[PDB]
Every structure is written in C-alpha cells, then in structure tokens.
Symmetry: C2
Subunit: 659 residues, 2 copies
C-alpha cells in the first residue's frame, strides 16, 4: 500500500468499489451519518484491515467489535487490503450509527470491496526478462545503476515481399519480427469478472502514436495472428479481462529514432475506468505507467573488430580486386563486392542494441543521387535515412564526411563510444556545411556527442580525405593519422638533395606520362608551394581541434605525407592519392597506392610510410585502384566500407551531460 | 597556459604570429630544416619560454644557448608566454640549422610573436559583478554550487511613447533600459595595434539572433548613444581594437522566454581572425565563448506577502468596493481599481529575477477577447503572451484556470517555488484542455514543474472554482482548501433536524425571492442530490491528485461547504457563490459572501466557515459582490488579482530533473 485514495461512505446507502492492490483508502464516515447521530461502530471482513484515525492517530479495529467512537469530521477510517478477491470473498466494511438515546443503531452505511491486482510490467532492470512491478518502471535513468526499459526501432525487414522496413506499417507477418520487440506484460489477479461498470484500458498519447506500435498475439484455430492494439491511429485498447491470476503478453516496436524535437522517451498507460452514466466520460480510478527509451543509432570506429568488407568498383579493376581479396584473406573478414564510389559516400554502417536484441543498421545519405541504398535492408539488417525539406544537399552530406573516433577521455569526461566527427566550414565563412536534418539526427543520438571539424578547404570536403585512426597492435591504444603536406615537402627535398630530383611520379600510368612530373618539377613550382603551405595551415587547425576535443597529445599522432593542388574555388584536391584514407582491419592496413617518385625502383612514399607504421606492428598493403584508369586527376575510383562488431560497452551504461 | 596550438616554422622563412595568453604553441622545427641539415640550436627573447621536447620529455632552454640537438620529427619545441607584448617588446624564437661539417649555421628559421590577452567576461558566479575570466563561463549549471551567467527577457517598457515592450526592437532610448541587461566585458591587453592581417570579431548564431540583443554605449560629443551590435539581422561585429590594457563594456538583453524548442541557453563568441588572402575566408585563430541562461517566468502562491490588490467591478458595486477597501486597510497593501471579470481571467502576475535585477511580469491570456491587457506594461513591469496558431481557445485558457501551490516536498524531492496547477479533462474524454501553446510555455519554465488537475466537470472549468491555499498564521505551514458538497449536505441536514428546514436562501437578493429556496426545498430535490454526489466524486479525484503531487495528507486539508447545479453538458456551476475562491492577504481572508440559510439571523454557511478557520488565527471577512445585481445565477461579477513579493529562494539554486 502506497497511494491514498478517497472513497466516501454514502448517506444511508451502500457503496461498492474496486480496490486496486498497492493503494489504500481513506474513508469519510461522518458525511454519511444521519443528522443527530452521536457515535458510530463498525464491522469488517477477514481480509479487510481497518483503522480508526482520529486527528492523525490510528488504531486497528477487530472484525466484529462493539466499540464506539464519537462522530467527527476529523475521525475517519483507513482501509487496507493485501490480497485479491476470489469468488469466495466477501470483502466489506459496515458502519453503524447511534444517536445519544439507546444502543440500537439508527442507521447503517457500508462499503463493499472487490480487490484486484493490476500491473503493467516491463524489463526496467535491463536483464532481458520482465520482472514483476519494478517500482522504477515509470522513469528512465542513465548509467550502471540506471533503470528503465529499452525499445529498438524496428527498422529491419523480416520478409522480402514487402519493399519497406517493418515499422512503416501497422501489421506483423512473421513471428520472427517479435524478437525485435520489447515485451510488456499486463499482470492481473481478481475474481471471475470485474464488477459492473468497470473496464480496463491501455492507451497512449497522440504524440507517441507515431513513435510506437503495440501488438497482441492471438492463437485462434487457423493459426497465430498479430493484433495491432496501439500505434498510428489507435490511441486506446479496451482489454478483455480474465479472472484468477492472469497475464497478457504484448510486444512493443519503436517506429522512430531520437531526433530534433524527440527525446526518445515514450509512455504507455493502463487504466481501470469507471462508468458513471451516459454522456459522462469514464473515470480513471487507477493508472499504471511504463516508460521506454528508444535505442540510439551508434557508429563504429576503426579500432573495433571488422566483420565484413563492402567494396564497389568496376568489373575490370583487377589489381584492386586481387589486392583487396588478398588483404581480406589475411583476416577472418568476409568480402562483399558490388560492380565507382557510392558505398563510401552513400552509407554508414551503424548499430542498435537493447538488452534482448541488437542488429546493424544503415544510415542512407540524403539524395541530390535520385535513389536509396535500400537494397541492404533485410532480416536483422536495418535502415534509416533523413532527407532535407528546404535545405539543398552538397558534397558535405556524403558519408566520407562522417566518421567516429575511438573511445576517449577529455577533461576527465569519458566518451566510451567515441565521438562522431563531421567536416564543416568556419562559422562566418558562408561555406558548405552538412545539412541540418542529418546534423540534428546525429546530435540527437547523444551517446556519440558529435564534433565538427574543418573540411571545407577541400574540393570534395570530407574528413576522411585528411585523417583516420588506427589501433596500436598488442595494446589498448590508438593513433590519429593526419595528412601532412610539410612531411611531403621535407621528403622530396631530401630526395632531391640525394640526387633524385629527376625521379618521376606516376610511373605506370600512361595517361600521366606526357606530363613528366618529377621531384624537381614539383619543388620548383612556387605557387604550388604556397598553395600547400596554406593547406598545411588548414590541417593544423584541424589537428588542434582534434587534440582539444579528443584529449590527444602529439604522442598520439602520426603524419603521412600528402600533396594537394588548388582549384578555382581555392579548395584542395589530391595531387596523388590520399594514403590516410585506408582500410583498417586490425593490424592489417590497406593503403591507397601513392604512385610516388621511384628511387631504387621503390616508391619513396611507400617506403616512408612503411618506416613510420611497421615499427608499430602495423602490416601495410598498398592497394592500386587507379592503374585501370591510366591516370589520376584527384578523384578516387573505388569505395570500401567496413562493417564492424559493436562496442562491448552498453550505451545505456553511459551518462551523457544535460541538454 | 592550457590549450596547445600548432605553429610551424617555415622553411627558410620567418613566421609572425599572435600568441593569445592562456594558450601555448607546439612548434615543428624539422620541416623547416634544409635537406642535409643534421642538428639545430635556438635563441629566444626574455619573455618567451622555450622547451625542447624529445619524444615527450621536455627541457627548458636558455635565451642564448649554444646547445645543439639532433633534428628529428619527434623533437619539437614548446613555446610559452606569460605576459602581453608592449611596444618595447621583441618577442622571438630563432632556430639555427647546421650540417655535419662545420659549426657555422647553414640556415635559419624564426618565429616572431606578439602576445595579447583576449577574454570575454560575464558574471558567471552570479554575484552581480563581472569577474575576470571565470573558467566556468562557457557552461551553465544549476544549484547552490552552480555557475554561469543569467539574462533577463527585457519585456518591460522604459518610455510610454512606444506601445511595445523594449525587446521588440533593435534600439535603446533611455539609459535606464541598461539596468535590465546583463553586462559583458571584452577585456584585452596588448601593444598599440594588432599585427597586420588580424581583427577581433564578436558573433552569434542565426538561431540565437532572435533570442538576444547586444548594445555598446558610445559617448560622442552630443551625448550618450546605444549601438546595437548583435541581434536580429546582425550576426557579427568587427571590434575596434585599442592597445594597452583595455575593456569594452557591452549590455545584453534577452528577447524571448524559454519555450517549446528553446532551452533558454544562448551563446556569444569572440574570435581573433587571421586574413589569409582575398576570396579565402578568415581563419579563427582563437575563440572565447560565454553562455547565458534566460531567466524563467515564475508564479506566486498565496503564501507569499501581498503587495498590491488589483480589483475590477462596475462603478456602482458599493458593498464590494467598501468591503474590499476595509479588508486592504487591515493590511499594508495598496488597492488598485478598474471599472466585470477580466483581471482574474486575462492575467497572471509572475516575476523574473537575475542576480543584478528583477521585476514583476504579466502573462496575458490568449485572445478569443479581441484585445490585450497591455496597458499594464510599464517601467519594471513586464509583459508576455502566447497565442495559438491553429488550436481554438476555450474557457480553460482563462487564468482562473492557472494557479500555483506553495513550496512542497514530494517523495523526497523539494519544489522550493511550488508547482503550477492547471485544470484539464481526462485523457480519453475528448474534453476541454488549456491550449498547447500556453501549456508548453509553462512547462518550459521548468522551475514550477506543472501538474494538471481535473477541472472539466465544471461549466466554467477553472481550478480556482474548487480549491485554494492559505497560510497557517504564526507558522511556516499551509492548508489546502477544497470545495465540498458533502460538507454542505451534512450541514443542511443538521439544520433541518434542528427545525430550520424553512430557513430561506439568498436573503436580500430580490431577484431570487419568488423562487423561495429553503433548506427543505434543497434537501428534497432528488436529482440535485445525485448531481452533487457526482460532483463530490470529481472533487475527491482532484483531492487524490493534489495529495499525491503536492505530498499532502488529510492533516493539510480543510473542506468548505459548496453546492452546484448541473447544466445540459453535465458540468457544474455554482448554486451559491464559491467561498473557496478568496482573497488571501496573509492572515486576512476576503471570502465571497455565500447568502446561505439564515438561522438566528446569521448565515449558517458564514458561521460554519468561521468555526473552521478562526481557531487557526485566520480572520474572515465576507465580501458581497452580488447584491448589486439582486440575484445569483452562478456567474461571478467581479475579479481580483493579488500581486505578491517574489520568493526569497533564488530559482537558479534549484536543481530540476533531466528533460
Ligand atoms: Ca528484467
Ligand atoms: Ca510491421
Ligand atoms: Ca523486424
Ligand atoms: Ca529482426
Ligand atoms: Ca564514413
Ligand atoms: Ca561575478
Ligand atoms: Ca529596445
Ligand atoms: Ca527595459
Ligand atoms: Ca526596467
Ligand atoms: Ca490565476
């Protein structure tokens, strides 16, 4: 017994009421007394506990006492029951009223009770099973000691016959769908039927009706069916009561990820309703509430174990395919090929998790691209997208512009899932920026606390053009890799001094041959030197943001030589392939083949990169995606996306800061 | 020195840079080395601290040393300055490079520095004065130990010549306006001018531009003027630098209260910008940020000291005016009269507070009412309103439907400012509810954590028809007063038994006389008894919510007799005036005169109410607003609104729960 409820005795009459377990009644006996009545006595049944409360002081009374008390407005009853009524129950309290002359009652008022248990239960303690009436089920708190139930957006697709994600409709087809859903049990105990005038109703708000759906599983003659009882255009469901000790099992799906204007928290209610009369609304005698938080979309840094390597290229790029295959064979990853840069630009593999279930889910980049990537939608492979209404899409909406750091600690605050990284332009610049709809979505997931970098000095404008992360083998540490033009100039000047100035660039690319690009020709180009000094300033501005926002020092960073050429917008495009954008499969790195100056018949860029990485136990494989095209103009011709295992750290164990 | 910044030496050249105090530089000397260089040495000036960092291990170096170190990419410099450059400064670091043959330098690279202090300061520690560089000025935290700067919505009006609140424009006229504003100081130290290519810029986001305005005070020849430098349609302002130790004083106004979609937090930034070249955006070398939270609109419970009593009635309601005047004379309050129920329905007196300033502010009820209450707008008397776009206004939007509890503790959680109370209908009812725009606004203030009650069983539909709060004189406690029909029936039945059944109701109201309403006539009306039993159920449902949400027991509640009659919508209107809606001026209560049955030439309702309240030290005055109309049909003919002192508890010392 916790909540006090008001049930008044009625003058001269009998009051019948449902008593919901976990509450108790305060009972006015004074208003029902006939005028002139002096004192009262009371009788009560075996399973009803009665106290007489005078001015706050309470006294327990026997089932049949003859004891009398003075009638006063400040003398009331407190009525309690610990167990549900059966058909063998008579649960009652009877009050007798006496005037001052004579010991025979002049009147009587009584209270007839039917006790029932009503509890809407969910797995609040997050172990995957639904506990009985968790007192914390009506709130949601973060952290290891945190509590409250978790809900997955059911964004995958169980059967291929439908083009759309499961959550797009109000229907369930396969029982396998239920495995993606959170269980909710309405537990009751009581007699064979509810007393006349009562019904039990499940309901949700209009606002939450596009955030959830709730199904009930029926097992009629011709086989299992799934009834949608709450969700889009269904705000309430009248429950069919069955007596004795009973449980109704419901399955809940999320329809929507957290977003701008939506915290991710939703509510479901059950009420016992009392019929008053026609034209009068039913009265909510008792209400129980459970809360769900919808699980966030979470990205995967390069430090996490690789599962599948997705690759796209034209069918004839052979060296690329052979070299990627060899790379993947060194690992336990599976290779998937589509016959070309989209897989990098249009998709980001994320994941969702709840205590009972989790699956990978694809974020699909905004269309400019007239069509979705939706052919990856399948069983336990989910899909989500955001499209702008007004705002126009630019190159910064491509997911080459979307990355995530490993876990970091910054100013004493840990980010166990790392931090999302997105390239942007300076605030006063008037430059490009990723669309608000996508930015709002990433921020709304909250657990990856996104950081904006400066990518808009690049023609394409993506963060993965200038930076990446790699593990340090045999440790729990990692390194930030940064593109560096000054590293390239230093190396080339060294090679020139060594007598190598005539060493030629892009050997084996026949479409570059007539250009005859040598170290000498590069170093003597004055405007190019100035362009790249400026680009190093851009890289260093990013370096400072990353050290600041990721809690990094110079010990955590390695510089890879890079070179750019300025276009007419004053933005950088790669002069030779960017080696920093690499396939990271734990200790094995697929690195884009640079095609740098040959010294003693080895690329000096390759040899320099090996000398930096190999002492760490990182094994380097250079991958050639460009020879099939016979030249390099600054554009990458293939794409790869690695799908990884989720973090072992549970997101709900994080404690993000107030918003 | 806290933040590390990257400044690279440039090959063969000299690099000039501004050094902002509170940062330090990491300096690459390796990239600037000529090819073939083996070792390096360095010189530096008196006010520049230089460390040689090899692989993380740092060593301080003398101003002129001859010491040489091996050139390595992992050997860098750490450069620090503790004081701003003057005109007498030469701040520099020079690096000499040596090859393996000979001790004369083969080249030199150098760093020329100008150190400046730049700090954007606000009163983060909330004492009313602007401290120097509070490290917490860039966040906002709740509570006694909390920190970060507070901003008032400047919603009052300094001069009458303009019809609108001060914040509606971009202009400031009177210097008195500045007193409503938060101070923000840009503090700097440095030489006579910034080095070539730099400028300092204040800025805000597009989003915050309708939330704030920022003025600078100039004192030219012809007198003081106020320049709007940031706000609506001004997102940035280029600052005029003056050398030496300088401070620029700015004044910040809030334009908007917290609301749906607006947390109340805003940002203002200062950046040092570096010019690169034409067509290239300027680079933000350094940025400092301050945060403001806009103060919430807060209501006043009846326990707070009364300041002014606002009253509206027709000019000839004399008994009302005389009796209200007498009541107010017992107190130190001032009476204000307008010559009629609006003042209760259309306005709610709230207040705002910041450490430097606070003033009362009126919430104006949504129009159905074709015109605002805006004639209360004046100096230090502010105004705010919310109007629906789509949703239609009903009687539940009237501010008789808007109240606030005294401070309460509920389940261990304290609500030091009390909790806002608003009447509504049951969730499945399809009944009336206050408009979303107003509800969203009240919820968004956060510090009064609003609760919805059930008012929609009443024809008018206001919470102040059935409940109120009064202090308990000579204590810190209070009572909830509840209308009770059962209390009325009990009293009338007692009077009937006493021989008083023929005692007549509404004596002295000539328009009621032909009805000849007596106790007998009331008690024998069967359908009326049933109507009022139902209304008591409605009252008791509210009673339970209040005890639950306010942490109240039966000891905290007193029932006042009331009676209603049902209309054709099954809603209640007062049968005789509702005594619970009363003027509370501390120990003195103006109570609506009930016009109840006369027994021994005293109203039995008046005598019953005195017997309940007077033993507590509450002094009762019955006020007659209806005799001037000769009858009572259930409508109240006058209105009163009491403006009170604010709580002494500062809202920013509260810690509300996560949202
Ligand atoms: Ca559980
Ligand atoms: Ca479905
Ligand atoms: Ca599914
Ligand atoms: Ca599934
Ligand atoms: Ca990506
Ligand atoms: Ca201060
Ligand atoms: Ca103004
Ligand atoms: Ca003002
Ligand atoms: Ca003012
Ligand atoms: Ca009010």
């Amino acid at each position: 017994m916790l909540r006090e409820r008001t049930v008044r005795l009625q003058y001269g009459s009998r009051v019948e009421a449902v008593y919901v377990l976990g509450t108790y009644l305060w009972t006015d006996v004074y208003s029902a007394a006939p005028a002139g009545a002096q004192t009262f006595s009371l009788k009560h049944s075996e399973h009803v506990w009665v106290e007489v409360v005078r001015d706050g002081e309470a006294e327990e009374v026997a089932t049949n006492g003859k004891q009398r008390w003075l009638l006063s407005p400040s003398t009331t009853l407190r009525v309690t029951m610990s167990q549900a009524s059966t058909e063998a129950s008579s649960d009652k309290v009877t009050v007798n009223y006496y005037d001052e002359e004579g010991s025979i009652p002049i009147d009587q008022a009584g209270l007839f009770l039917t006790a029932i248990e009503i509890s809407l239960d969910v797995d609040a303690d997050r172990d995957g099973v639904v506990e009985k009436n968790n007192p914390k089920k009506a709130s949601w708190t973060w952290g290891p000691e945190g509590q409250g139930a978790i809900l997955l957006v059911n964004c995958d697709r169980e059967t291929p016959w439908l083009p759309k994600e499961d959550c797009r409709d109000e229907k369930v087809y396969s029982k396998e769908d239920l495995k993606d859903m959170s269980q909710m049990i309405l537990r009751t105990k009581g007699p064979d039927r509810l007393p006349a005038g009562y019904e039990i109703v499940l309901y949700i708000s209009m606002s939450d009706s596009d955030k959830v759906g709730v199904f009930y599983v029926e097992n009629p003659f011709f086989g299992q069916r799934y009834i949608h009882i709450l969700g889009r255009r269904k705000l309430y469901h009248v429950v069919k009561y069955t007596g004795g000790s009973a449980e109704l099992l419901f399955f809940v799906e999320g329809l929507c990820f957290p977003d701008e204007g939506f915290s991710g928290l939703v509510s479901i209610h059950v009420s016992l309703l009392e019929y008053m009369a026609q034209d009068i609304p039913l009265t909510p005698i008792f209400t129980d509430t459970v809360i769900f938080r919808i699980a966030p979309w979470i990205m995967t840094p390069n430090i996490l174990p690789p599962v599948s390597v997705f690759v796209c290229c034209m069918k004839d790029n052979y060296l690329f395919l052979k070299e990627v295959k060899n790379l993947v064979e060194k690992t336990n990853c599976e290779l998937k090929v589509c016959f070309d840069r989209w897989i990098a630009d249009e998709i980001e593999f994320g994941y969702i998790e709840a205590p009972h279930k989790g699956f990978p889910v694809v974020l699909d980049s905004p269309r400019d691209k007239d069509f979705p990537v939706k052919e990856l939608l399948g069983p336990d492979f989910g899909y989500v997208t955001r499209e702008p209404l007004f705002e126009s899409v630019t190159s910064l909406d491509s997911f080459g512009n979307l990355e995530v750091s490993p876990p970091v600690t910054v100013n004493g605050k840990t980010y166990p899932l790392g931090r999302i990284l997105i390239g942007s332009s300076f605030p006063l610049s008037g430059g490009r920026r990723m669309t608000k709809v996508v930015r709002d979505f990433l921020k709304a997931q909250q657990v990856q606390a996104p950081v904006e970098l400066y990518s808009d000095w690049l023609t394409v404008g993506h963060v993965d053009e200038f930076m990446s992360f790699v593990p340090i083998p045999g440790t729990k540490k990692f390194l930030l890799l940064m593109a560096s033009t000054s590293a390239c100039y230093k190396l080339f000047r060294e090679k020139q001094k060594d007598g190598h100035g005539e060493a030629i660039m892009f050997k084996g690319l026949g479409g570059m041959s007539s250009k005859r690009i040598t170290i000498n020709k590069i170093l003597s180009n004055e405007s190019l030197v100035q362009e790249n000094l400026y680009f190093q300033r851009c890289l260093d501005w990013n370096r400072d943001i990353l050290k600041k926002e990721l809690g990094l020092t110079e010990q955590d960073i390695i510089d890879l030589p890079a070179l750019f050429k300025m276009d007419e917008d004053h933005r950088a495009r790669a002069f030779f392939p960017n080696m920093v954008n690499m396939i990271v499969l734990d200790k094995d790195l697929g690195i884009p083949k640079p095609f740098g100056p040959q010294v003693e018949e080895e690329c000096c860029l390759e040899m320099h990169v090996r000398g930096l990485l190999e002492p760490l136990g990182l094994e380097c494989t250079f991958i050639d995606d460009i020879s099939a095209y016979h030249k390099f103009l600054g554009e990458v011709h293939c794409g790869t996306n690695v799908r990884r295992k989720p973090f072992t750290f549970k997101w709900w164990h994080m404690v993000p800061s107030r918003r």
